[PDB]
Amino acid sequence: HMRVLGLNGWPRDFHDASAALLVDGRIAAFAEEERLTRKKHGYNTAPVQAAAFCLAQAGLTVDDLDAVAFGWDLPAMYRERLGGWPHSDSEALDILLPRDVFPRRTDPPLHFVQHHLAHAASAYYFSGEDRGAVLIVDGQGEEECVTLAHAEGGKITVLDTVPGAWSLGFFYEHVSEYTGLGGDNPGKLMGLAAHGTTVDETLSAFAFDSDGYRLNLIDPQARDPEDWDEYSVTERAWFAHLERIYRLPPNEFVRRYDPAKGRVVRDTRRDPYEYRDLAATAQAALERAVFGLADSVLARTGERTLFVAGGVGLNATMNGKLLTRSTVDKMFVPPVASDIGVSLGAAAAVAVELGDRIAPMGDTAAWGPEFSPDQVRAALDRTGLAYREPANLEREVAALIASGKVVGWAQGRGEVGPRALGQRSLLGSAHSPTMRDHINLRVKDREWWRPFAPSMLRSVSDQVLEVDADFPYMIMTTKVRAAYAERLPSVVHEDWSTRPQTVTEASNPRYHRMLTELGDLVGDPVCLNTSFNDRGEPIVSSPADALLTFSRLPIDALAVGPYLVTK
Ligand SMILES: Nc1ncnc2c1ncn2[C@@H]1O[C@H](COP(=O)(O)OP(=O)(O)O)[C@@H](O)[C@H]1O
Ligand SMILES: [Fe+2]
């Protein structure tokens, strides 16, 4: 047995802390810190709880680990940008795995893995494909924002990098901030781009070529020597530039006491919808730049399989278009493309270095905590709420869904990454023409223009989608076929695009069953599947989490374990 605990998250100036445990190349456990702490984005923290969970889940202690792997070259970053790496391996271990939570007889080997390598590792080793081109597109690793590499024979070899100042991630963030959606919500920007019109995709900043892009707005060698990313530098350049060329100035945040809620709430001066054309344009500029990069690495390696990771990898809209490109046959992007994924990537890199074979993820991301019926009961009995234990839960849930009701679904092991995949999901009819507005405005109280996405049986996805492939992670848009382009109004765009999760019975028997039962009711085993949370809070993880969010939202029912709660 080779056991490698991979980590991300650090007390100084970090985000998306997470922890993954590989055992014999298999994922034993994987969790994001935010899910357990309830603090969004897992900011400025070692993945303390996530690692504790991995170890408990696998019944291990630190002393049972062959290696601890960290998904950045921290010593390097501390050398170049802070004037020295002051930590012994043991001292660093004390910070990443505090002894009061993680008792240990001795230190495990500590490995720092280069940030993009980890990103790449988390794509390649888990793709189930044995070779391909690697495209890593990011905010910024230690010094680079893009990495093009060749993945073959269990090896990842770098061909080229792009300096952070030219970051597509930072660009897209900055635009996201400029619009008032916020730099921490780029996904929203993507959503918004769909409502805009693109005028000049260069933004008078980018110049696109056949190998990607160049950004004459900023000197590519511009370092913010103070910090250890070029975020501030790119932020000034982009904000001043956008204000010059775009009709709207930066949207501003407004903080006022709301007597209705009894607190200071943050709002935006302008409606971010006003910025839709700027979103469209940013989206298009990102796509264009990324199309170039993809073509370039594909051709430099002579592969037709593409691997994508780094946070830009979360842009399903851009991925869908990569997939349909003539330069692309197959595509894998892991559900943990962002930094949460570099704990797993670091682990994989190390495990591979230690002689392990890494198994494929295989159409599921359900690696987080799960809870026994007794545990769920404990959480239920805490609330003093009445609940049933349906003979056939999956059928009853299907019936509620078919009737246009919204059902919280908390089953098995939490999924990892930003997307609910039927372990912690809010479910609704994919068939209702009013469901989208209902969930947006009445249920989640979020923006009217936000889109929804479907889960469907893999077994019918060939009839529903123009591509007969696995889409396990909702990480890629594709188009529906004619016969379904109006059947599914809540989850299909006017242009027939959608962002689907395909569901194998192996991946999720319960979800699979529920969908099957739904098909027997409304013809298609397809439903609307949106993240289970009140907006701005992370996806629920524990039954107590589920009950809390259920109690605060006008959801109709909660299916948590084998129990069903109604309002
Ligand atoms: N849907 C999206 N489309 C485009 N870019 C995105 C999207 N989601 C996240 N990003 C980008 O990913 C970046 C974060 O990447 P990540 O690898 O998680 O961390 P880091 O950049 O610190 O290495 C952000 O700069 C953000 O702009
Ligand atoms: Fe990254």
For residue 79, the tally of other CB atoms under 10 A from its CB is 13
d(CA 334, CA 373): 30
Helix/strand/coil for 332: strand
Is 47 near ligand 1, meaning CB less than 6 Å away? no
Resolution stated for this PDB structure, in Å:
2.4
Is 525 near ligand 1, meaning CB less than 6 Å away? no
Q: Whose CA is nearest to atom 4 of ligand 1?
A: 312
* 76 Cα: distance to centroid of ligand 1 (angstroms): 22
Q: Which residue has the tokens 């004390």?
A: 94
- The b/e string for 441-474 (b: 16+ C-beta within 10 A; e otherwise) is eebbeebebbbbbbbbbbbbbeebbebeebbbbb
In the chain, CATH 3.30.420.40 covers 1-113+342-361, 114-341
Q: Which residues are annotated as a binding site for carbamoyl phosphate?
A: 419-420, 499, 529-531
Please give the DSSP secondary-structure letter assigned to residue 388.
Answer: B
Is 138 near ligand 1, meaning CB less than 6 Å away? yes
d(CA 460, CA 468): 9
Q: Which residue has the tokens 């070899």?
A: 157
* Environment class of 547 (CB within 10 Å of its CB; exposed 0-12, middle 13-18, buried 19+): buried
The amino acid sitting at 59 is: G
d(CA 118, CA 16): 14
d(CA 210, CA 290): 10
- The b/e string for 387-412 (b: 16+ C-beta within 10 A; e otherwise) is beeeeebbbbbbebbbeebbbbbbbb
Assigned CATH for 362-566: 3.90.870.20
Of the candidates 360, 357, 302, 300, which has an alpha carbon nearest to the alpha carbon of residue 329? 302
CB 430 within 8 A of CB 354: no
CB 431 within 8 A of CB 489: yes
CB 346 within 8 A of CB 173: no
Best residue among 40, 138, 308 to mutate for probing ligand 1's pocket (most ligand atoms within 8 Å of CB) is: 138
Reported as half-sphere exposure (CB side, CA atoms, 13 A), residue 262 has a value of 0
* 404 Cα: distance to centroid of ligand 2 (angstroms): 40
d(CA 502, CA 365): 12
Residue 104 CA, distance from chain mean position: 32
Q: What proportions of the chain, in percent to the nearest 5, are helix, strand and coil? A: 35, 20, 45
What does each C-alpha distance from 365 to 59, 281, 437, 548 come to in angstroms? 20, 32, 28, 24
Q: Which ligand has the nearest atom to the CA of 194? A: 1
Bridge partners for 565 per DSSP: 558
Question: Would you tell me which CATH number, out of the four given (3.40.50.720, 3.90.1150.10, 1.10.10.10, 3.30.420.40), belongs to the domain 114-341?
Answer: 3.30.420.40
E strand or H helix that includes residue 560: strand 557-560
For residue 207, the tally of other CB atoms under 10 A from its CB is 12
d(CA 338, CA 134): 15
Q: Which residue has the tokens 């893999």?
A: 458
Best residue among 116, 117, 314 to mutate for probing ligand 1's pocket (most ligand atoms within 8 Å of CB) is: 314
What does each C-alpha distance from 308 to 64, 117, 130, 557 come to in angstroms? 32, 12, 15, 37
Q: Beta strands 478-479 and 26-32: pairing type?
A: unpaired
Is 313 near ligand 1, meaning CB less than 6 Å away? no
15 is catalytic: yes
* 11 Cα: distance to centroid of ligand 1 (angstroms): 20
d(CA 309, CA 120): 6
Is 173 near ligand 1, meaning CB less than 6 Å away? yes
Question: Would you tell me which CATH number, out of the four given (3.40.50.720, 2.102.10.10, 3.30.365.10, 3.30.420.40), belongs to the domain 1-113+342-361?
Answer: 3.30.420.40
- The b/e string for 88-115 (b: 16+ C-beta within 10 A; e otherwise) is eeeebbbebbeeeebeeeebbebbbbbb
Please give the DSSP secondary-structure letter assigned to residue 116.
Answer: H
Considering all CA atoms of the chain, what is the largest pairwise distance in Å, rounded to the nearest integer? 65
E strand or H helix that includes residue 544: helix 543-552
* First and final C-alpha spacing in the chain: 48
